[PDB]
Amino acid sequence: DPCYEVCLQQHGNVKECEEACKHPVEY
Q1: Under a CB-based contact definition with an 8 Å cutoff, are residues 17 and 1 in contact?
Q2: How far apart, in whole angstroms, are the C-alpha atoms of residue 26 and residue 10?
Q3: Would you say 2 and 23 are in contact if contact means Cβ atoms under 8 Å apart?
């Protein structure tokens, strides 16, 4: 996913990153 990668690029794992990406994808 674009959001996830962008996040991951300079962020931790899912958990917080998820809440920040606000993208309810397949985990």
Answers
A1: no
A2: 21
A3: no
